[PDB]
Amino acid sequence: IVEGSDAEIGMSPWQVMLFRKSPQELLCGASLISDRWVLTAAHCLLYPPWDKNFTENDLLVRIGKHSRTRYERNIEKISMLEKIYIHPRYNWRENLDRDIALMKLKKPVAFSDYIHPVCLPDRETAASLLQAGYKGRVTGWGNLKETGQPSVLQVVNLPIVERPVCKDSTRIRITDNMFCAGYKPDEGKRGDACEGDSGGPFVMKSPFNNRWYQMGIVSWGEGCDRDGKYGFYTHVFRLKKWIQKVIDQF
Amino acid sequence: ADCGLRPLFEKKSLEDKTERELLESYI
Amino acid sequence: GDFEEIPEEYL
Ligand SMILES: COc1cc(C(=O)N2CC[C@@H](O)[C@H](C)C2)cc2oc(NCc3cccc(Cl)c3)nc12
Ligand SMILES: *[C@@H]1O[C@H](CO)[C@@H](O)[C@H](O)[C@H]1NC(C)=O
Numbered sequence: 517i518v519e520g521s522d523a524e525i526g527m528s529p530w531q532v533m534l535f536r537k538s539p540q541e542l543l544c545g546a547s548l549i550s551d552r553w554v555l556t557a558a559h560c561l562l563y564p565p566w567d568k569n570f571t572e573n574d575l576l577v578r579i580g581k582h583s584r585t586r587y588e589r590n591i592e593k594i595s596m597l598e599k600i601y602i603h604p605r606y607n608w609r610e611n612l613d614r615d616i617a618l619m620k621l622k623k624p625v626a627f628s629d630y631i632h633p634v635c636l637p638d639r640e641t642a643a644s645l646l647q648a649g650y651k652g653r654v655t656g657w658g659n660l661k662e663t664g665q666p667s668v669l670q671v672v673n674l675p676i677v678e679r680p681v682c683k684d685s686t687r688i689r690i691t692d693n694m695f696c697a698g699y700k701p702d703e704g705k706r707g708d709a710c711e712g713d714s715g716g717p718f719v720m721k722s723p724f725n726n727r728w729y730q731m732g733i734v735s736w737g738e739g740c741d742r743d744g745k746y747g748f749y750t751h752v753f754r755l756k757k758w759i760q761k762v763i764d765q766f
Numbered sequence: 767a768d769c770g771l772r773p774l775f776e777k778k779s780l781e782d783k784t785e786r787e788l789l790e791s792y793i
Numbered sequence: 794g795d796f797e798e799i800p801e802e803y804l
Contacts, residue, residue, distance in 0.1 A: 576799070576803060587799045594800075632772060636769075651787060720788065
């Protein structure tokens with residue numbers, strides 16, 4: 517996260533680190549949606565162009581964390597993956613359309629002051645909250661700038677951007693399964709996700725019921741925090757038929 | 767039933783330092 | 794060792 521600040525303790529209790537076993541390194545962010553299910557970006561797990569194709573036994577999920585590198589004994593909990601489920605129409609070839617995947621943990625994780633699930637939006641929350649100008653919050657342990665790394669979990673609040681402006685920022689084709697977010701140049705505040713933040717949550721706090729909803733998944737951008745560019749997020753609500761479908765069947 | 771209510775914030779009625787920025791953008 | 798060692802039970 518570029519131009520963010522340190523998270524408060526327990527600020528983002530749904531944050532998950534996807535951690536590679538060998539070499540031991542940060543793979544991506546992710547989020548906890550129940551005691552056994554974790555949400556992330558498909559391209560955290562599968563992306564042929566960069567020869568990424570992670571199997572269950574390659575990775576671990578670290579929940580309850582604040583410090584990036586330390587083992588937070590008797591705070592964090594580390595979970596093994598039972599199974600990965602990638603959206604069957606995830607378009608890695610062109611534009612990261614439907615950049616979404618689920619991971620079922622081997623055992624349920626115990627909730628705690630530091631570990632707690634985020635809500636998924638329903639159609640009404642989406643329609644209420646996913647509006648140009650409305651801010652969400654993006655958290656992660658990714659780079660502090662494009663071209664270094666945080667001691668602790670970083671947070672930034674960013675406005676959702678009008679769809680034409682998102683389109684006009686890029687040569688990539690933007691689908692209804694994505695929204696972008698970020699300050700414009702003339703807004704003179706900044707902030708963005710960056711490398712290692714992919715997979716992590718874009719959350720909003722509903723003013724109607726005072727709960728947090730994951731509206732987005734950190735997906736992609738062209739550089740980090742550049743003037744005139746924005747971050748692109750998976751639209752969680754548009755893909756919730758699939759989420760429900762996976763969770764109901766498995 | 768408990769989703770999105772943080773044990774250290776909503777659960778104890780404490781606000782984090784920037785959640786008001788979000789609220790203020792919601793209209 | 795950029796990351797601190799995880800307990801071996803998780804590996
Ligand atoms: C394969 O994954 C990625 C690709 C690309 C990429 O160079 N693209 C050009 C070609 C096009 O096909 C791709 C759709 C995007 C950029 C990525 O940035 C990230 N994560 C970092 C991050 C940084 C800034 C903002 C946010 Cl929301 C995210 N994951 C990326
Ligand atoms: C990814 O790996 C799985 C299992 O190893 C394999 O079945 C799948 O086709 C692979 N896809 C690649 C390498 O693009």
